[PDB]
């Protein structure tokens with residue numbers, strides 16, 4: 038319980054660095070730079086360099102995906118660490134590449150791939166190990182085949198590497214490029230629960246033989262058709278170590294009740310014959326078409342053979358079924374009940390923070406440039422799902438191919454070489470490919486996190502007591518923000534969640550006037566979209582559409598009933614905005630619907646930005662058009678092309694016509 | 697006396713929970729600060 042560490046995820050995806058807690062390293066006589074022997078299971082062991090990282094837990098150790106596969110261990114297992122002082126540098130180490138990775142790529146694995154790996158990098162060696170080198174639009178696994186000083190060699194600039202030879206084979210070594218948790222970004226929190234409910238029925242299939250508890254059995258994934266579904270299940274079963282069969286919807290419908298009734302039974306029989314079963318019902322929208330009263334006799338039996346095959350079967354037999362649909366409202370209601378799909382999982386469009394991680398993952402095999410600032414691209418990529426974030430990663434890597442052809446001609450079948458690596462991908466390959474931009478998820482209810490500073494407010498002493506830490510031993514839950522326009526009513530609730538650390542949903546009046554108003558309308562889709570997100574603030578601007586001048590005066594009443602009931606939720610709040618508080622029906626003001634009213638001294642301080650092309654105030658006070666005078670001041674950019682930034686003589690020309 | 701907002705003044709009195717983290721429960725000097733803006 039003191040040396041027994043639990044393997045965890047790696048902050049840095051390095052095959053040699055494993056991070057640990059320093060107070061635990063203070064117990065086991067270790068500091069940075071020293072090497073440690075780590076043996077996990079099946080008598081296998083490797084050896085790596087430690088580091089003092091206080092981020093990890095005390096009884097937990099950080100291990101990388103390739104470090105995990107070398108010990109024949111997987112995440113959630115206990116490993117033992119031993120001090121390794123008896124180690125010395127090595128003379129010769131023979132490195133052969135792996136068969137399943139040298140696909141057409143040729144040249145010299147040492148000059149292109151292996152040199153940058155070990156250049157000034159001091160790394161330990163095993164006699165029988167495998168490892169991955171990400172470079173040149175791909176990744177070629179290598180194998181250590183010999184070790185000169187016993188089995189614990191250490192590479193250094195003083196080392197002779199005879200990489201000459203044949204592509205060695207692999208032996209029960211799962212592809213180190215297979216899907217993993219380090220390959221799924223933008224849904225870290227979404228992976229928390231899915232990894233808290235499949236962690237036991239798959240990794241610990243012991244208690245579930247002798248416990249009367251009914252374990253989770255029916256998982257229902259949903260989200261965007263663009264991305265975020267197949268990998269959520271692929272990165273789990275391929276990483277947790279579970280048998281993975283993914284039944285595709287379109288194939289089943291391609292029969293005449295032949296492989297429609299068989300593959301449904303057979304794959305349900307096949308997955309159960311193995312102990313860890315993960316069944317991915319891809320395109321369940323095509324199989325289950327909600328309550329389709331007008332259809333053919335095959336959909337009335339392909340869904341009729343599915344429910345009976347999961348309530349009778351899939352009962353403590355260590356089988357976790359996983360559905361996948363574009364919308365959780367186009368499949369039969371009898372799918373989500375008890376035992377079958379009682380679990381549901383939201384896959385939302387990645388926020389600005391989540392877009393950056395997935396950008397990193399896919400942009401790893403490439404060699405980029407320092408002018409490339411993927412952070413700036415990670416901001417202006419709303420409406421972009423993991424597919425489109427990978428779709429431009431192709432058009433960004435492929436634009437570098439034609440733009441740098443030139444001398445290379447008469448391409449051989451295996452012409453790739455060191456030219457493939459070091460292929461610097463300029464930022465223009467992004468911009469020109471992003472010039473033909475094409476997003477997908479634009480009409481969606483976006484879940485994200487506000488990244489705006491509270492300094493740019495200049496308010497009127499907003500009482501801090503309009504907040505709570507969910508620690509009490511009833512509280513008001515309805516507030517509205519009215520007053521003049523521009524004073525801050527739109528950006529007001531944005532900076533509140535900056536300190537509260539909660540998701541937000543910006544909704545407008547005519548947004549609820551969606552043609553898809555025919556109870557679980559978008560109105561209720563938006564309500565329940567923020568129900569899973571806990572806590573979540575529902576901001577509503579343009580609420581002036583409450584009055585008159587079909588379902589004209591409807592949707593309001595529709596909005597009314599849904600507001601109540603949320604008072605028991607406690608961890609959810611509703612805020613609105615308006616400018617003409619007269620034509621609004623006073624219904625919302627009623628207790629429960631809303632329970633507070635906030636207006637909007639003198640002109641307050643306001644924090645600007647863009648302080649680089651700036652040039653050096655409160656007297657002008659003698660917001661409304663705060664940004665309007667700012668952008669026009671930047672628009673007054675002197676074009677004396679044939680130094681100057683901002684100036685005063687340009688302000689006086691702006692207030693001549695403003696209002 | 698010299699309902700309308702019966703619970704409103706009650707929860708705000710509990711919301712006036714002194715956070716002197718670095719005993720006190722309900723008090724009068726916190727009521728007078730509540731009726732300054734009520735309606």
Ligand SMILES: Nc1ncnc2c1ncn2[C@@H]1O[C@H](COP(=O)(O)OP(=O)(O)O)[C@@H](O)[C@H]1O
Nearest residue numbers: 220221222262263264265266267268395423424
């Ligand atoms: N959340 C994510 N994180 C990282 N990559 C993703 C994510 N979602 C999608 N991708 C990438 O997009 C590609 C296609 O998306 P996919 O998962 O097939 O869509 P879906 O599962 O919704 O049909 C995948 O190959 C994957 O690499």
Ligand SMILES: Nc1ncnc2c1ncn2[C@@H]1O[C@H](COP(=O)(O)OP(=O)(O)O)[C@@H](O)[C@H]1O
Nearest residue numbers: 493494495522523524525526527643660663664
């Ligand atoms: N302290 C501030 N208060 C209000 N608005 C500000 C402030 N500082 C900058 N602004 C700018 O003024 C604009 C006012 O919000 P806006 O989007 O115009 O919505 P509305 O006019 O409906 O309130 C913001 O977009 C913001 O860029």
Ligand SMILES: Nc1ncnc2c1ncn2[C@@H]1O[C@H](COP(=O)(O)OP(=O)(O)O)[C@@H](O)[C@H]1O
Nearest residue numbers: 511626627628629630699700701702703704706
């Ligand atoms: N004697 C009382 N008479 C009325 N309301 C009371 C009384 N004691 C406490 N209250 C509180 O005042 C609130 C008044 O009811 P409310 O839910 O506001 O509906 P409405 O305002 O439409 O009558 C109740 O929710 C209750 O918590």
